[PDB]
Design an enzyme around this catalytic site. Sequence first.
Site, PDB file in Angstrom:
ATOM      1  N   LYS A  61       0.851  -1.186   0.000  1.00 42.58           N
ATOM      2  CA  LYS A  61       0.000   0.000   0.000  1.00 42.58           C
ATOM      3  C   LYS A  61       0.890   1.240   0.000  1.00 42.58           C
ATOM      4  O   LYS A  61       1.276   1.732   1.071  1.00 42.58           O
ATOM      5  CB  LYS A  61      -0.921  -0.004   1.221  1.00 42.58           C
ATOM      6  CG  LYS A  61      -1.858   1.180   1.287  1.00 42.58           C
ATOM      7  CD  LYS A  61      -3.278   0.818   0.846  1.00 42.58           C
ATOM      8  CE  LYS A  61      -4.084   2.098   0.652  1.00 42.58           C
ATOM      9  NZ  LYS A  61      -5.523   1.847   0.472  1.00 42.58           N
TER      10      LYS A  61
ATOM     11  N   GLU B 158      -2.205  -2.273  -3.593  1.00 40.41           N
ATOM     12  CA  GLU B 158      -3.490  -1.633  -3.348  1.00 40.41           C
ATOM     13  C   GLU B 158      -3.358  -0.122  -3.558  1.00 40.41           C
ATOM     14  O   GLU B 158      -2.473   0.511  -2.980  1.00 40.41           O
ATOM     15  CB  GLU B 158      -3.967  -1.944  -1.926  1.00 40.41           C
ATOM     16  CG  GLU B 158      -5.458  -1.617  -1.685  1.00 40.41           C
ATOM     17  CD  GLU B 158      -5.895  -1.812  -0.225  1.00 40.41           C
ATOM     18  OE1 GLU B 158      -6.690  -0.977   0.277  1.00 40.41           O
ATOM     19  OE2 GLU B 158      -5.439  -2.788   0.428  1.00 40.41           O
TER      20      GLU B 158
END
Lengths: 227, 226
Positions: A38, A109
């Site tokens: 992320k 992500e």
Amino acid sequence: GGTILVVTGTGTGVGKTVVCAALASAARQAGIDVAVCKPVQTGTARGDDDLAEVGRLAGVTQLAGLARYPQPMAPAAAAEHAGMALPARDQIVRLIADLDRPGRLTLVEGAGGLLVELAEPGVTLRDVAVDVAAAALVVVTADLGTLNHTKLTLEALAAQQVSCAGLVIGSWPDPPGLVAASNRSALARIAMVRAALPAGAASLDAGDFAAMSAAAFDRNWVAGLVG
Amino acid sequence: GGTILVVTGTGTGVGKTVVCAALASAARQAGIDVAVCKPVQTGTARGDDDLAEVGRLAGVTQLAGLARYPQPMAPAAAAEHAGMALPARDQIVRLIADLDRPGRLTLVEGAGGLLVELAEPGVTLRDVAVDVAAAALVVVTADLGTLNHTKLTLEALAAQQVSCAGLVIGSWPDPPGLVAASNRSALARIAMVRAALPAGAASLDAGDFAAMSAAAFDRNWVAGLV
Ligand SMILES: Nc1ccn([C@@H]2O[C@H](CO)[C@@H](O)[C@H]2O)c(=O)n1
Ligand SMILES: Nc1ccn([C@@H]2O[C@H](CO)[C@@H](O)[C@H]2O)c(=O)n1
């Protein structure tokens, strides 16, 4: 290298993070080494931490972050509100290529939707997809408006020749309403629906989530992502 | 003939109809003849008719449409559930061209967002804007996610060489709030923000609505449309 997948959504709050966790849990259960990345996280002052939640739901330990901003806003706005800068394009690609390695599934992500800005100037998850040569798994809703948003996200993928790994309805209601049911059918005519995660999947415990994840995805698709 | 502006949204429930009404009102009050064409309507079970809403808010009388489905779903799914097909691409383009006359701002209201199936076979509002050489005015929200949805939609417009006439924030909240204040400045950096319409303007009577509408739009941009 291995296989890199960017997980993006047609919008905000579509369940990207638990889709991330689900595919990670399903891919671990097929004997695939999973890393979850992320690069931009907003809303930390409110407790938001998507990397953390993937660890709690999917049991993943190869978690990779980079930029964290307190305010729950688009990254550009969260950074500026905190006097911080966005990361550079190469800082994000470096974070990904470092995790990459053969036989590994690396999940990247995004922050909100596909064209959200992650690095200056107008650098998006989609440009990062091109750099690391990743395909994109698109998380959608079953609610009204999904078809337009899905088609827009798919068109923006194709315009840079980024491959569509398919869709995932991130939150699937039981029982489905009439609207939800037609949208699910219409979505499958658009692209392949790799999974439809049951609503509340994020309140499942470790074993329940792993079971849920293994049933959500087709084993053969999951295994075929890494060669 | 005249000016044909398609009015599209980044999504459903963003104030697209109110924006249509408000632009029609502002344009009339500059002495422009306004027609509004909404080829396909849905959701007329739960008490709808966006053309009626434009007539009540804006006082437009040239109100044109072809199809109406009761189900609150996208056209194709409402049509499918109905047992009855969507209009032909021909019907829609010919109707819009029949409306279009010199001096007239003809607004074309989409059903939902830019890329949903409007006609047969699989024709979208984007295809329609191309066929009638219409710019597109994009209705957007101020909430989290608007910047993605707005880039996605503007990219979809440019991809087919449909000119972008600007953005309109369909519902400006009171009080603004943290993300809405930011998005407004950010949205203004992608495209011209022609207006931000106060929340609740749908409930206004005709005199208030027209007063809100005259205030909302730049009088010289409205007139320069036609
Ligand atoms: N299948 C899903 C999808 C989402 N969620 C929860 O809903 C929010 C994002 O959709 C997040 O709050 C997430 O935890 C969930 O519980 N189950
Ligand atoms: N500026 C605006 C925009 C929208 N609305 C109302 O909100 C509903 C959802 O778009 C619309 O159907 C309309 O009733 C409003 O009152 N004022």
